Design a protein around this ligand. Structure first.
Ligand code: CLA
Ligand code: CLA
Ligand code: CLA
Ligand code: CLA
Ligand code: CLA
Ligand code: CLA
Ligand code: CLA
Ligand code: CLA
Ligand SMILES: CCCCCCCCCCCCCCCC(=O)OC[C@H](CO[C@@H]1O[C@H](CS(=O)(=O)O)[C@@H](O)[C@H](O)[C@H]1O)OC(=O)CCCCCCCCCCCCCCC
Ligand SMILES: CC1=C(/C=C/C(C)=C/C=CC(/C)=C/C=C/C=C(C)/C=C/C=C(C)/C=C/C2=C(C)CCCC2(C)C)C(C)(C)CCC1
Ligand code: SF4
Ligand code: SF4
Lengths: 165, 94, 74, 731, 74, 80, 31, 35, 41
């Protein structure tokens, strides 16, 4: 319980929702054979639905009055009540991958900017160089922090074009 | 215009080089009967002044107000007629 | 290429053979979706022990008028 | 051909545009021929007088129509079972079924049901009979005539105020804070103590007997002796009946907090106490600036002293006093921004804290008032930013503001616009992504896969106010906390009783749907602000047009050169921002209306479950609540909702018509008009009739303005019709 | 757009239907002949009345049609 | 009647004069550029405002500027 | 106690006077 | 309402007489050549 | 062969191949690890 939320394990609405979904799937399954293709597909869907509901209830997710899982997006609140995998951990994972792609693109652009013909390098990508920079982008946090503390990650305001006010 | 050949410009006859033609106008003073013409010009004697002709239009404005205050009721307009019962509304209102 | 794809789908992912036996109750279908993110719900119960997307191109009627009858011909 | 008396250049225009531009530039006094600063200020002052007279006449008309064709007296006896009447209906086009269908609140004929809430307001301030309303209307009529005479008088040379008089900011602020704000609030407190409070207790107090009635049993003695606490001895009981003496009291300045159990609105004694405190504080604040009595403050020195060391803010606020006093657009922009924010505050406070008796029970009036004030606030905000841009392009002097906050904020305008764009992109990407994800999982029949982020921050703030529905036990949620014990016997009892009840709108319960809609609102606000700020900062010039300030605030473009310069002026930025403001206000009103629609019907589950995906918004709100509206008239008959159905289609038509001016541009119409002119000049009989002005297509800027006007009118009319018809056909 | 709307409403109100030995039961009951003369009829009896099938397709095989219906609007 | 102005940044390329559709600009002798010629607008009354001259100017910023002002029967391009 | 016809007539006359003052102010503003 | 005849006279005056008069006067004034 | 590899390195070809590879990887991740609502490690 965080904000009046009940765990999905003890939520009656959650169980009723699972029961209703499985019931609808079985109702659709009743109009087929026992080993036909549609019957097997419906059985697989039923198994997946049951596994999903069981996993959600076992993972400790919080359910509201409507019986659906709710996510806690607040450090500390999610860390002390065991909900860090809702938004905190996904935030870290995203930030890492997003920074990886961004750093790889930045390095490729800066590397090809020194070539005699950079526009062609932009429309016709250098596959080996792009591959090497994509691999190097995995250490983007360390490289970015080093460049920031080094002062080479920024451009002087006096060297950037600006409008005549 | 002096269009005797292929010349459609003439400074001495610039009036004809700009297409200033009546096309269909025709001057003729022999048409309307004198007795009927006199009757109409006599009927519309002083009504040729802007202030006087506007007065005739002002009569139309009075007729508009007369219709609302009398004409509308004489034609049994639904808005000037009566009303029958009413309803209560969605909930306990009026 | 587009026509070949239409005939191939009508021969491998359709219920044309079953639709021929009951063209008034079985709804024509010539597309089957893979089960990846719950999208398998799009495989409707068209009829004839087949599940797929209901098509409205009229290919089943055209093939019937041409006397296709079998899936090997498609 | 000389109608634009204020513009000699426009008078020389031989086309119809002369008339058009002759009306759209009538209030731009600064651009008129032979205009000075003194004449400009005097004309604005007289225009202000005229506007005040118009407002007074409008209020007088409302009062007169309610007292002449309304049912105010009948509504007073039964405020919950009688629909207020706005005015009568006299339409010769009405048919018999229409005449019979519009007769409702016991009227003699067809009438219009009021939706502005004037009945509840007038009933709460003490008005009870039609004679009082008529007297108020006559008084407002005389007041309007007086203001008109004042406007005419101050235009005469003997009564013309000098330009320096208009620049006396200290004196004006002193009089406005101490007199326009403080004295007015004190007078309102006097009226509430002498009329509103006694009238709510079943005692009539009017001009004929207000001098023989004691507002309090102990008259004036406790006030002058200092025993002010004696004015809050016995307040109205919890079982008090409005307009009657059962369960009444004698207190006039209480602070119970909460809502009246019967009227579901704020206590009159609390509002009187509020106005008295506000009057005292405003008067005190009014005694601050220096005038001619050797004491007070000098705003110029205060601004010149607000310069932090280390040069973090540069020169600080040096020269800002003159920048604001000399420029009228700066003052208008500040006033518009403040007024718009206050309008939004008023809209947000009147539904959660109803101030008028029997106002919360009127679902139609509450929704209409909230939507009206929110739309007004949006338009006023757009105007504030537009005038800020006008200031930058017409009254900003770089030499006079060298190094202050204005020059510095203009020096890094790129960072501001870039961050606004980033915030807008983030909000849009994620709000749309979450909504689409929920829609996709809902379509596949798997609602358990929805991404429902709990609004823990807003819930925490709600718990800080006393709501115990989230188990936080924070400040006001804990009975043993210091703030809880401090106001334990003051306003906390009623405040908590009203905030912990689900029967009112005082801090409603929120969930994932509220989280998503709030982020959508944040998106609308950020994008609208980005457009307006970008237009105001780039008004003087950009890389594409370095000398934009030389072309003024509004101009069609700069030609197709340099890649194209369509919609490059600041006016165009405001034009593009109006669309976003309408969209944001639409989202806000949609959220408010749907939530209250579910609350009024006792079904919060509908919004709690269908608001997490867009299909629920389109099906459970727009399509579901439009059945009665579109059924106002059908091949079977018509009802009182036919007016709203017609207005619904009318708004749709105006909006679509605006789409023409918005999509089609000037070029096609010019050639078409030329062809039409040729046809007229070659048609017999019709040749005898000529045009005085050469017919030409609408201007580029004029076309954008016409299209925007049509779009806004259709938007407002359509939503007003749908809102009123949906909340009126059900309640 | 107007042409296809006219065709759809006309066929659903005066052509398509079922025969029950007692007459023809059209899909919309023939409301075109009494409502297509006004814009409100087109908005209510055609756009609003016939849109309930696409806005209620979530959770079924036609859910895709309900998704595109929104996507297109975007 | 629009306002057409020429600035000293002009290089005398004569492109604006050739791009004018109503013969509003012309080249006159000058000594501030290598071409020894400057552009001028003696017949601004015939200017329509098409801004074709600006689209042809190669200097940065433009050496020829058109400010649309009071509209006349000639500036509006009306043949009726 | 509904307002009588004389009250409506008096209000209309006062409105006429107010309109006269308004037109005078408008004329002064035009100058 | 008191004086039921007033709306039947004021509505046409404000919607028919006043608009026609105002439009005619405005049209005559915006094309005066010398105001 | 050099020209063919250069054509395959163009912005549209590389964009479509990268999008296809990313989409395929995501589809297989969801196929083997479906209904991943939270990051359960
Ligand atoms: C993004 C804005 C934001 C907001 C609105 C909140 C709000 C909240 N945080 Mg939080 N927090 C944030 C960012 C935020 N946090 C970030 C970025 C971090 C990482 C450093 C944390 C780490 C954090 C911890 C470790 C804790 C909270 C806690 C709390 C709750 C009570 C603390 C409080 O506000 O008392 C007043 C705050 C003052 C500064 C005074 C409260 C609802 C506490 C909690 O879980 O509640 C029991 C808790 O211990 N937060
Ligand atoms: C020209 C139009 C056309 C269109 C629109 C489609 C569309 C479709 N086809 Mg199809 N197909 C077509 C032509 C077409 N096909 C033709 C001409 C043939 C004969 C060669 C086939 C043979 C075929 C088979 C055998 C299968 C499909 C399948 C599919 C479905 C999934 C395809 C997929 O994502 O695989 C993967 C996407 C990729 C990018 C990988 C493709 C790799 C191949 C080898 C590239 C070849 C070049 C899809 C709806 C599949 C299906 O129906 O699922 C039930 C299926 O198994 N098609
Ligand atoms: C005590 C002296 C005094 C007073 C009472 C006023 C009063 C006024 N002056 Mg003035 N002025 C003064 C001294 C004073 N002035 C002096 C000394 C100078 C020279 C320095 C000026 C120079 C001056 C100028 C140049 C102008 C004015 C203007 C105005 C008018 C402002 C517009 C308006 O009416 O909105 C009314 C404002 C309020 C009622 C206060 C607003 C309170 C908030 C914003 C509203 C919300 C309150 C509440 C919630 C509303 C609920 C009500 C609801 C139930 C309906 C106003 C009546 C302007 C004008 O319009 O000219 C006619 C104007 O142009 N004054
Ligand atoms: C206290 C409020 C206030 C004041 C005093 C001003 C004053 C001024 N504004 Mg401003 N403005 C405001 C608020 C205000 N504004 C707001 C809230 C907005 C946002 C909409 C704007 C947006 C704005 C812009 C974009 C511009 C101005 C401009 C101006 C200046 C000239 C105005 C003019 O030319 O008049 C002319 C008046 C009109 C043309 C009337 C407009 C016609 C309306 C919009 C149509 C209404 C139709 C109606 C609703 C239809 C009913 C529907 C029914 C038929 C079914 C002037 C000094 C202009 C300027 O500064 O010049 C450089 C300028 O371009 N304003
Ligand atoms: C539904 C209509 C619509 C939509 C979606 C947008 C969206 C947007 N507007 Mg816009 N606007 C609109 C109508 C709309 N506007 C109208 C009618 C007007 C009046 C003319 C304006 C005027 C206006 C102005 C003046 C500005 C914007 C800006 C923006 C951007 C703000 C940033 C943001 O919100 O991030 C979110 C981004 C989105 C919601 C776009 C969706 C992303 C897509 C769906 C992802 C792609 C996935 C997939 C691969 C699609 C490709 C498929 C294809 C290859 C086949 C944004 C992209 C501002 C801006 O540029 O911001 C910097 C800006 O200044 N708008
Ligand atoms: C799991 C699904 C998902 C998807 C499909 C997306 C998709 C997207 N996200 Mg997003 N995000 C997600 C989950 C997801 N996000 C989660 C769970 C979180 C945690 C709450 C975030 C937080 C997040 C942020 C803060 C941002 C995005 C942004 C974006 C957009 C550009 C991302 C990018 O890397 O571009 C390409 C990469 C670059 C162009 C350069 C790298 C830029 C990254 C984001 C900076 C990372 C390093 C930096 C120091 C981090 C500090 C950020 C600061 C605010 C604290 C994109 C459409 C960005 C955006 O909205 O654009 C305006 C954005 O800034 N996301
Ligand atoms: C619903 C919006 C709307 C409306 C009403 C119109 C209307 C019109 N368009 Mg248009 N158009 C629109 C959207 C709209 N368009 C959009 C979004 C675009 C962008 C693609 C275009 C692009 C476009 C082009 C390119 C052209 C038109 C043309 C026309 C005109 C055709 C002549 C005609 O229809 O006869 C009659 C007019 C109507 C039926 C409109 C409704 C008028 C009602 C029925 C009369 C009501 C009388 C009134 C109420 C009484 C007076 C009351 C008093 C208070 C004033 C017409 C006025 C063509 C044109 O110029 O005409 C030949 C033209 O070439 N449109
Ligand atoms: C701005 C306030 C306002 C508004 C919007 C209305 C609106 C209306 N009035 Mg009303 N009226 C008002 C003030 C107002 N009145 C006042 C103060 C009085 C007291 C004298 C009256 C007395 C009155 C009577 C006796 C009647 C109406 C009637 C009507 C209805 C038909 C209009 C008509 O033909 O009557 C004409 C209205 C008048 C002769 C007086 C109105 C004068 C106002 C104050 C002019 C205000 C102009 C405004 C401030 C400037 C805006 C510019 C604009 C003119 C372009 C209509 C809904 C009729 C009705 O009941 O319909 C069923 C009716 O018979 N009114
Ligand atoms: C509310 C305000 C109402 C205002 C009413 C104004 C009425 C018009 C008015 O007074 O005009 C004043 C003018 C002044 O004329 C003047 O008439 C003068 C003579 S006398 O003064 O009229 O005797 C004469 O000397 C002078 O030349 C001439 O200009 O008088 C007329 O000539 C009006 C005569 C109208 C005759 C036509 C009537 C309609 C005929 C319809 C035909 C078919 C119908 C079936
Ligand atoms: C552009 C421009 C302009 C305009 C501008 C604008 C328009 C602005 C605005 C703005 C706005 C619109 C703002 C707003 C705001 C707000 C704020 C700033 C606030 C706040 C806060 C606080 C401080 C609070 C606190 C509290 C309390 C008191 C109690 C309870 C709790 C709380 C926390 C709530 C100008 C002319 C000037 C200049 C130039 C140009
Ligand atoms: S705007 Fe057009 S007409 Fe005027 S000078 Fe330039 S090119 Fe010539
Ligand atoms: S185009 Fe520019 S540079 Fe060339 S002659 Fe004209 S003004 Fe001078």
């Amino acid at each position: 319980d965080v904000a009046g939320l009940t765990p999905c394990s003890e939520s009656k609405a959650f169980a009723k929702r699972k029961k209703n979904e499985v019931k609808a799937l079985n109702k659709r399954l009743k109009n087929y054979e026992a080993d036909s293709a549609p019957a097997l597909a419906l059985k697989a869907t039923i198994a997946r639905t049951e596994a999903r509901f069981d996993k959600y209830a076992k993972q400790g997710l919080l359910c509201g009055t409507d019986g659906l899982p709710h996510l806690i997006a607040d450090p500390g609140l999610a860390l002390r009540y065991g909900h860090a995998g809702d938004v905190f951990i996904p935030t870290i994972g995203f930030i890492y991958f997003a920074g990886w792609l961004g750093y790889a693109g930045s390095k490729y652009l800066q590397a090809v900017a020194a070539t005699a013909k950079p526009i062609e390098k932009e429309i016709i990508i250098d596959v080996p160089l792009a591959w090497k920079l994509l691999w190097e982008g995995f250490g983007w946090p360390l490289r970015a922090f080093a460049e920031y503390k080094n002062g080479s990650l920024m451009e002087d305001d006096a060297k950037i074009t600006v409008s005549p006010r | 215009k002096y269009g005797e050949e292929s010349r459609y410009f003439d400074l001495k006859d610039l009036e004809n080089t700009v297409g200033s033609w009546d096309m269909y106008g025709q001057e003729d003073k022999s048409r309307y009967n004198g007795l009927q013409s006199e009757f109409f010009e006599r009927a519309a004697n002083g009504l040729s002044r802007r202030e006087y002709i506007l007065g005739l239009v002002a009569i139309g404005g009075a007729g508009i107000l007369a219709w609302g205050g009398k004409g509308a009721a004489d034609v049994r307009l639904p808005t000037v007629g009566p009303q029958q019962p009413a309803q209560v509304g969605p909930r306990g209102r009026l | 290429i587009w026509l070949s794809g239409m005939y191939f789908h009508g021969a491998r992912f359709s219920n044309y053979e079953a639709w021929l036996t009951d063209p008034t109750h079985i709804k024509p279908s010539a597309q089957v979706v893979w089960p990846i993110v719950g999208q398998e719900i799009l495989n409707a119960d068209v009829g004839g022990g087949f599940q797929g997307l209901q098509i409205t191109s009229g290919f089943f009627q055209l093939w019937r008028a041409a006397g296709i009858t079998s899936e090997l011909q498609l | 051909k000389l109608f634009p008396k204020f513009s000699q250049a426009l008078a020389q225009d031989p086309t119809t545009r002369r008339i058009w531009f002759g009306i759209a530039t009538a209030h731009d006094f600064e651009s008129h021929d032979g205009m000075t600063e003194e004449r400009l200020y005097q004309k604005i002052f007289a225009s202000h007088f005229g506007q005040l007279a118009i407002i007074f006449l409008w209020t007088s008309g409302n009062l007169f129509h309610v007292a002449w064709q309304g049912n105010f007296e009948q509504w007073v006896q039964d405020p919950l079972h009688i629909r207020p009447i706005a005015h009568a209906i006299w339409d010769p086009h009405f048919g018999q079924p229409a005449v019979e269908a519009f007769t409702r609140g016991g009227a003699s004929g067809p009438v219009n049901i009021s939706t502005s809430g004037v009945y509840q307001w007038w009933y709460t301030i003490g008005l009870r009979t039609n004679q009082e309303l008529y007297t108020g209307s006559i008084f407002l009529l005389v007041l309007a005539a007086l203001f008109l005479f004042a406007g005419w008088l101050h235009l005469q040379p003997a009564f013309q105020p000098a330009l320096s008089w208009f620049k006396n900011a200290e004196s004006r602020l002193n009089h406005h804070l101490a007199g326009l704000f403080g004295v007015s609030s004190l007078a309102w407190t006097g009226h509430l103590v002498h009329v509103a409070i006694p009238e709510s207790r079943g005692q009539h107090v009017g001009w004929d007997n207000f001098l023989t009635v004691l507002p309090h049993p102990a008259g004036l003695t406790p006030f002058f002796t200092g025993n002010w606490a004696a004015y809050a001895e016995n307040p109205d009981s919890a079982s008090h009946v409005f307009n009657t003496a059962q369960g009444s009291g004698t207190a006039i300045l209480t602070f119970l907090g909460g809502f009246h159990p019967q009227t579901q609105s704020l206590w009159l004694t609390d509002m009187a106490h509020h106005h008295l405190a506000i009057a005292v504080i405003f008067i005190l604040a009014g005694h601050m600036y220096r005038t001619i009595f050797g004491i007070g403050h000098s705003m110029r020195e205060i601004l010149e002293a607000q310069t932090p060391p280390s040069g973090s803010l540069g020169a600080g606020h040096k020269g800002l006093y003159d920048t604001v006093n000399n420029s009228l657009h700066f003052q208008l922009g500040l006033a518009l921004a403040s007024v718009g924010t206050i309008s939004s505050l008023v809209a947000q406070h009147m539904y959660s804290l109803p101030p008028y008796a029997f106002l919360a029970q009127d679902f139609t009036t509450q929704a209409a008032l909230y939507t009206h004030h929110q739309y007004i606030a949006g338009f006023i905000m757009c105007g504030a930013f537009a005038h800020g841009a006008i200031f930058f392009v017409r009254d900003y002097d770089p030499a006079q503001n060298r190094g202050n906050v204005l020059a510095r904020i203009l020096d890094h305008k790129e960072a501001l616009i870039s961050h606004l764009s980033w915030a807008s992109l983030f909000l849009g990407f994620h709000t749309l992504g979450l909504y689409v994800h929920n829609d996709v999982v809902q379509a596949f029949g798997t609602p358990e896969k929805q991404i429902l982020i709990e609004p823990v921050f807003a819930q925490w703030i709600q718990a800080a106010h006393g709501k115990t529905a989230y188990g936080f036990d924070f400040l006001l949620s804990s009975a043993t906390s210091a703030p809880s014990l401090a106001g334990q016997a003051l306003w906390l009892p009623g405040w908590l009783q009203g905030i912990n009840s689900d029967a009112n709108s005082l801090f409603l319960t929120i969930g994932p749907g509220d989280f998503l809609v709030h982020h959508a609102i944040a998106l609308g606000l950020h994008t609208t602000t980005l457009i307006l700020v970008k237009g105001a900062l780039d008004a003087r010039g950009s890389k594409l047009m370095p000398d934009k300030k030389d072309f003024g605030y509004s101009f069609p473009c700069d030609g197709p050169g340099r890649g194209g310069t369509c919609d490059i002026s600041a006016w165009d930025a405001f034009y593009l921002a109006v669309f976003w403001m309408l969209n944001t206000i639409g989202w806000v009103t949609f959220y408010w209306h749907w939530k209250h629609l579910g609350i009024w019907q006792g079904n919060v589950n509908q919004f709690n479950e269908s608001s997490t995906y867009l299909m629920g918004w389109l099906r459970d709100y727009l399509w579901l609540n439009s059945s009665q509206l579109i059924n106002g008239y059908n091949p079977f008959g018509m009802n009182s909702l036919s007016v709203w159905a017609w207005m619904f289609l009318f708004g749709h038509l105006i909006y679509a018509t605006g789409f023409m001016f918005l999509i089609s541009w000037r070029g096609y119409w010019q050639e078409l008009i030329e062809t039409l002119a040729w046809a007229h000049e070659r048609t017999p009989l019709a040749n005898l009739v000529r045009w005085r002005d050469k017919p030409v297509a609408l201007s580029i800027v004029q076309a954008r303005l016409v299209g925007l006007t049509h779009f806004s009118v259709g938007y407002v009319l359509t939503y007003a019709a749908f809102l009123i018809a949906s909340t009126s056909g059900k309640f | 757009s107007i042409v296809i709307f006219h065709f759809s409403w006309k066929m659903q109100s005066d052509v398509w239907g079922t025969v029950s030995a007692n007459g023809v039961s059209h899909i919309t009951g023939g409301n075109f002949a009494q409502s297509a003369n006004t814009i409100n009829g087109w908005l209510r009896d055609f756009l609003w009345a016939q849109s309930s099938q696409v806005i209620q397709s979530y959770g079924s095989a036609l859910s895709a049609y309900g998704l595109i219906f929104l996507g297109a609007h975007f | 009647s629009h306002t057409v102005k020429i600035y000293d940044t002009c290089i005398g390329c004569t492109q604006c004069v050739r791009a004018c559709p109503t013969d509003v600009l012309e080249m006159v002798p000058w000594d501030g550029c290598k071409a020894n010629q400057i552009a001028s607008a003696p017949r601004t009354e015939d200017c329509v405002g098409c801004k074709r001259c600006e689209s042809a100017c190669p200097t940065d910023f433009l050496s020829v500027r058109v400010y649309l002002g009071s509209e006349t029967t000639r500036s509006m391009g009306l043949a009726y | 106690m509904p307002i009588a016809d004389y009250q409506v007539f008096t209000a209309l006359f006062l409105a006429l006077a107010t309109g006269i003052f308004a037109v005078r102010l408008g004329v002064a503003l035009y100058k | 309402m008191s004086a039921q005849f007033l709306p039947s006279i004021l509505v046409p005056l404000v919607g028919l007489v006043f608009p026609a008069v105002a439009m005619a006067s405005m049209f005559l004034y915006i094309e005066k050549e010398e105001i | 062969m050099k020209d063919f590899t250069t054509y395959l390195s163009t912005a549209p070809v590389l964009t479509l191949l990268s999008v296809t590879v990313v989409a395929g990887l995501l589809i297989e991740i969801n196929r083997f690890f479906p209904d991943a609502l939270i990051a359960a490690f």
